Design a protein around this nucleic acid. Structure first.
Ligand SMILES: [Mg+2]
Ligand SMILES: [Mg+2]
Ligand SMILES: [Mg+2]
Ligand SMILES: [Mg+2]
Ligand SMILES: [Mg+2]
Ligand SMILES: [Mg+2]
Ligand SMILES: [Mg+2]
Ligand SMILES: [Mg+2]
Ligand SMILES: [Zn+2]
Lengths: 152, 71, 304, 177, 120, 173
RNA sequence: CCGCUGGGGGCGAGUACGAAAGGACCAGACCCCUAUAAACCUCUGGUACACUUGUUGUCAUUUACACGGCAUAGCAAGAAAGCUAAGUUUUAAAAGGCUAGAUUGCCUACAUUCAAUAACACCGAAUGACCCCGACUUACAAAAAGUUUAGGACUAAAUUUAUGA
RNA sequence: CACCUCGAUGUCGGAUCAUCGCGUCCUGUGGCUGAAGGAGGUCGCAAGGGUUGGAUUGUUCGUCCAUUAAAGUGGUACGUGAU
């Protein structure tokens, strides 16, 4: 992590926004992805404009405390094509965790954003970290705790 | 083997990029007569240069030689 | 051939003070680079990878073994191959040895590349390459990797760039068969034939074999034997063919295809051939020929 | 389709080989009749190689060389010039009897044009270099040429003083038979 | 190189002056070469017991293509000939005729080293 | 601050033979001797030249080194391509047993360690069996010449369809 | 992201089995072949049209000596480079290739000439230059190497018109 | 059936070159075996790459010559004439 703490501090995006930190301990990937999508679009702001791309810098820690309920570790797949004949590639969720474990929440947030050309800028602002610390230690960052889970 | 529609002015301009010529980055200029050519080419009076005054070659002395002229 | 690189929005809303202090305290707290390796002969760990070599193809010749069989032998030449750069796990992400070969004059090289050799203190090489190596295989900068790095009977994986042939059709590039010379075939004796399959595919596949400029392609010949090593003259005598024309440099490495981790009992010196008595060796001068080893093999004419 | 340039061989010059050899024979005859001719680069390079071959054949001075040049060289006014003036002029030159200077492009087809001329003549465009360069016997080259088997190869007049003591003799004339 | 549907002169006194190769036993899908056994069909008889039109087994003893050896030498024969064989890997002929019977052979063909006039 | 000559500059050592201009060890022909070895210099100390104008010379010297080594190991008679030859050849397929061959040689096929010849013998019983032999193979013991037949042509491939009766040199059975 | 690792027969075994004829699973490894794929010209061959030899007709030839033109390169035979296969090597777990690339390092970098299709040559050269071309030698290269700055890549002086190129 | 093209649009063949599915002919394999291992019959997984000759018919139909481990069946406007 000698240079990984350096590269994540290199910012391409606009920075008039607010930084958010979310602990993903015990959170279901779908509901956390819904809340992260709402924060990323900037619709938690009274000054929201559909044309203007505001939002928040969402930082997620503990990406491997994230669970997939009802045997979706072996049955949920991730499929794409290569453009070549026979190019269907389907990866299971356990193999997706064993390849890159932050991609579960990454793809879940990607499927919930609006499908336009502002999606690249919104997916920049989602920074998902597997372990419990992030490079933005000294930053002024405001925590987003979700509403309590016990509706059931 | 036949165009199905008419080419637009923008598409025609994009297709015609191969037809354009590259500018040359060097030129050999004679200070007297103002002639212009490549640095590897003679452009004096022996070649085509009606403006040549001979000042392009500044020294040529070779008087002595001896041989059998075949007649 | 690159994507549109960087929007690069400059304004940080004054969070730049935190990022600049974080970067200053990040470079200053990173560990000091490990010391110069200084290698002498080392043990043979079974899961340990050795370096490679940049050798020059010099053509093919004829030799006969003691059993009396002709062997097609190409000859390679090691052109003062040295270690130029080094990469290791603490300071770089990987552990590699950077090799250089040949020589070029100062006026014949770009100033950006000549500066790298002048800082390293090595002569100006004409080719620079690198190989992945283990932690115990890091040989210091300036160390020669000659023919003595390899042994007779060893199997190597030679990597070469093929001969340029120009643009050719599908008859000799993909080896396709054409149409008959004289049965009514009209202007199609070397046609590729059907390429798509009608409306249902509706397109040509992304990997379709069509005529193109083949040539200069990095093809590797796997698991080829080493028949003779001349340490004094830097010559290795592989058996079989090597891709590329004569005079182009090729790459060599121990064959990872035949890898039981035993290295098949080949007598390989692990870090390199660490030379004892490097003194009393002549420079390019009136030297002579030296002695070489060779493998034998059993029963080439066991029966008829 | 056979590779001629890139694999050192004769140019094809867009012609069949019998036409090609006849055109080169005509051009070498023209090159020695008028000592500077102007042509396209490909014919100019081919003419330079052919001129070296023909001039050395004239330098041999033998009867077989005359017989071979009699078919190669057309004029006969210039067969005499090749065997006498050109042979005496380049008697000690180790090749390179011709220079090439590029002269731009021609109007009819925009083909590159080169001037091809014989060196070491009154009316040439660059000073020649001497074919030989008398050696200092007090330098490294002379000692390398003494330890190794090299001749002296000094510059010489047409008849050196080493034949003067034979030709001075009145008993070595035979009266002209 | 003996391709399929070729012709060759059987040399022994088994009763076949000529035969046509109609198949190859091994996975050799290209050509046959000296020392190989192939299925041949007798087109023309010598008038004796082996009449024309039979399908027997033959081993090729010599060919007009060069036969390369490991040392680097090769043997070139001016004829393409073969010798008939039985279902026991033995020639039905009493002796391989010396008219075209010189070959290089020591692998289990010791029975063919007595039928031939001379080896090598 | 600290000027010093490096270990790379310790290649400024005295030569082994103190007065040499041509390298020696060259297996090239008699005159115009080469003034550099094609293997040792590596451009560290050399009158520079292109590679593949240096590894072609390297191929020539390596071929010649083996060729005079075999020539020292056994001598051979000087012979043309139109003469009857007898070859003492040991067969590696057999237990290295020497078998004598006799035939007219129809070619001195090549030059180098890959020099070869082709001896043609019409066996009066089995017709003509021509054999190709590498001249510098270790399986040759010696050859001698007995029969001379002068021909203008250097390759006698026209004897493949001439009178087969007058090509009888060996009928071992 | 592409390619993607094919088999058969022996040896294992006259075998464990099995009254007995009748003969294996293991491919685990070694020996042969054969594909497919990737190369290479070392061997063997093919071709080789400014190479060598022989020869016919005819036109030139104050010698119907030599040489030259045309007749498919007139014909026929034999060739070296280059290309090529029918030739020669290699085809394991993952190997191997292609495109983008965090990084790291470096920077005396405007890009002209050496032949109009560099594919020779950028893993080459431009005069402190053998890069190209020519000349000389080599039958133990039926010719691709070695010497050589003769010619072209221009260029400089108060210690060499200049490298031991 | 006549919904689509008659301001006319290659199918009923193979020659070359392909891609995909598995209801697997082989190679890789597991169960039941009336299972002496062989040699078979099914049944379960598996589509990586292999499926050659030509004599006869305009035949994509079919044999039968004899070789292989086998001489697979289909979607491909019963693939493929701006080749
Ligand atoms: Mg027509
Ligand atoms: Mg053409
Ligand atoms: Mg003609
Ligand atoms: Mg060759
Ligand atoms: Mg030739
Ligand atoms: Mg005429
Ligand atoms: Mg071609
Ligand atoms: Mg010059
Ligand atoms: Zn002027």
């Amino acid at each position: 992590e000698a240079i990984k703490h350096l590269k994540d501090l290199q910012h391409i995006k606009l920075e008039g926004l607010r930084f958010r930190i979310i602990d993903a301990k015990g959170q279901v990937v779908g509901r956390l992805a819904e809340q992260i999508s709402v924060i990323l679009q900037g619709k938690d702001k009274p000054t929201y404009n559909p044309t203007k791309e505001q939002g928040d810098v969402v930082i997620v820690v503990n990406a491997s405390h994230v669970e997939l309920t009802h045997d979706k570790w072996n049955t949920k797949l991730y499929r794409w094509h290569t453009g070549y004949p026979g190019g269907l590639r389907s990866r299971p969720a356990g193999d997706q965790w064993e390849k890159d474990p932050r991609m579960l929440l990454r793809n879940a947030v990607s499927g919930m954003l609006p499908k336009n050309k502002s999606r690249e800028a919104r997916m920049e602002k989602l920074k998902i970290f597997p372990e419990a610390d992030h490079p933005f230690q000294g930053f002024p960052l405001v925590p987003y705790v979700p509403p309590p889970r016990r509706l059931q | 083997a036949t165009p199905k529609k008419k080419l637009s002015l923008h598409r025609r301009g994009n297709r015609r990029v191969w037809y354009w010529l590259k500018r040359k980055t060097e030129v050999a200029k004679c200070s007297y007569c103002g002639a212009l050519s490549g640095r590897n080419q003679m452009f004096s009076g022996a070649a085509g240069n009606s403006a040549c005054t001979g000042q392009c070659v500044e020294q040529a002395p070779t008087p002595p030689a001896s041989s059998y002229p075949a007649e | 051939g690159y994507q549109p690189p960087k929007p690069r929005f400059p304004l940080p809303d004054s969070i730049a003070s935190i990022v600049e202090e974080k970067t200053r305290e990040h470079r200053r707290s990173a560990p000091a680079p490990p010391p110069a390796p200084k290698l002498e002969p080392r043990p043979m760990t079974p899961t340990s990878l050795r370096t490679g070599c940049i050798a020059t193809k010099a053509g093919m010749t004829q030799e006969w073994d003691e059993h009396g069989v002709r062997v097609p032998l190409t000859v390679l030449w090691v052109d003062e191959c040295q270690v130029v750069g080094l990469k290791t796990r603490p300071v770089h992400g990987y552990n590699a040895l950077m090799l250089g070969s040949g020589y070029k004059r100062q006026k014949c090289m770009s100033p950006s590349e000549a500066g790298f050799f002048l800082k390293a203190g090595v002569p100006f090489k004409k080719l620079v390459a690198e190989w992945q190596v283990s932690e115990d295989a890091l040989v210091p900068v300036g160390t020669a990797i000659g023919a003595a790095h390899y042994v007779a009977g060893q199997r190597v994986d030679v990597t070469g760039w093929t001969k340029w042939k120009g643009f050719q059709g599908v008859m000799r590039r993909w080896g396709f068969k054409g149409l008959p010379a004289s049965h009514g075939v009209s202007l199609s004796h070397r046609a590729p034939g059907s390429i798509g399959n009608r409306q249902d595919p509706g397109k040509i596949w992304k990997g379709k074999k069509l005529p193109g400029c083949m040539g200069d392609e990095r093809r590797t010949v796997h698991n080829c034997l080493v028949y003779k090593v001349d340490a004094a003259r830097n010559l290795v005598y592989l058996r079989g063919q090597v891709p590329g024309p004569v005079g182009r440099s090729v790459f060599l490495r121990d064959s990872r295809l035949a890898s039981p981790a035993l290295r098949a009992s080949w007598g390989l010196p692990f870090p390199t051939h660490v030379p004892s008595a490097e003194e009393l060796k002549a420079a390019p001068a009136p030297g002579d020929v030296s002695v070489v080893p060779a493998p034998d093999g059993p029963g080439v004419t066991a029966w008829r | 389709a056979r590779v001629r340039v890139r694999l050192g061989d004769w140019n094809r010059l867009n012609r069949k080989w019998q036409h090609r050899v006849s055109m080169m024979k005509t051009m070498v005859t023209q090159l020695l009749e008028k000592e500077r001719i102007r042509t396209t680069l490909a014919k100019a390079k081919t003419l330079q190689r052919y001129a070296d071959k023909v001039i050395t054949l004239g330098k041999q001075g033998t009867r077989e060389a005359w017989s071979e040049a009699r078919g190669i060289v057309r004029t006969d006014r210039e067969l005499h010039k090749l065997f006498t003036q050109v042979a005496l002029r380049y008697r000690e030159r180790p090749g390179g009897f011709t220079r090439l200077v590029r002269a731009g492009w021609r109007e009819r087809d925009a083909a590159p044009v080169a001037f091809v001329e014989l060196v070491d003549r009154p009316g040439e465009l660059r000073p020649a270099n001497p074919a030989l360069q008398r050696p200092n016997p007090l330098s490294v080259q002379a000692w390398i040429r003494q330890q190794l088997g090299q001749p002296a190869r000094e510059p010489s007049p047409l008849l050196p003083p080493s034949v003067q003591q034979y030709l001075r003799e009145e008993n070595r004339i035979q009266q002209g038979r | 190189m003996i391709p399929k549907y070729s012709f060759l002169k059987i040399v022994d006194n088994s009763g076949a002056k000529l035969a046509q190769v109609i198949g190859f036993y091994g996975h050799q899908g290209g050509y046959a070469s000296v020392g190989d056994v192939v299925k041949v069909v007798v087109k023309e008889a010598r008038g004796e017991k082996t009449t024309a039109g039979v399908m027997r087994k033959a081993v090729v003893v010599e060919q007009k293509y060069p036969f390369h050896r490991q040392n680097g030498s090769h043997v070139q024969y001016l004829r393409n000939a073969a010798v008939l064989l039985s279902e026991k890997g033995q020639p039905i002929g009493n002796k391989v005729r010396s008219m075209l019977g010189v070959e290089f052979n020591k692998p289990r063909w010791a029975k063919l080293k007595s039928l031939s006039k001379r080896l090598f | 601050r600290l000027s010093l000559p490096q270990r790379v500059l310790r290649d400024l050592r005295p030569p082994v033979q103190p007065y040499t201009l041509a390298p020696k060890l060259a297996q090239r022909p008699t005159t115009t001797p080469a003034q550099y070895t094609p293997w040792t210099p590596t451009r560290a100390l050399q009158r520079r030249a292109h590679v593949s104008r240096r590894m072609g010379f390297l191929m020539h010297v390596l071929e010649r080194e083996q060729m005079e080594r075999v020539r020292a190991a056994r001598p051979l008679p000087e012979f043309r391509a139109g003469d009857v030859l007898e070859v003492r050849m040991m067969v590696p397929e057999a237990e290295r047993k020497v078998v004598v061959y006799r035939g007219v040689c129809i070619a001195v096929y090549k030059k180098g360690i890959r020099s070869s010849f082709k001896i043609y013998n019409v066996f009066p019983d089995s017709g003509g069996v021509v054999q190709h032999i590498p001249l510098y193979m270790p399986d040759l013991v010696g050859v001698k010449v007995v029969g001379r037949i002068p021909a203008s042509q250097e390759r006698l491939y026209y004897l493949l369809e001439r009178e087969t009766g007058t090509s009888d040199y060996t009928f071992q059975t």
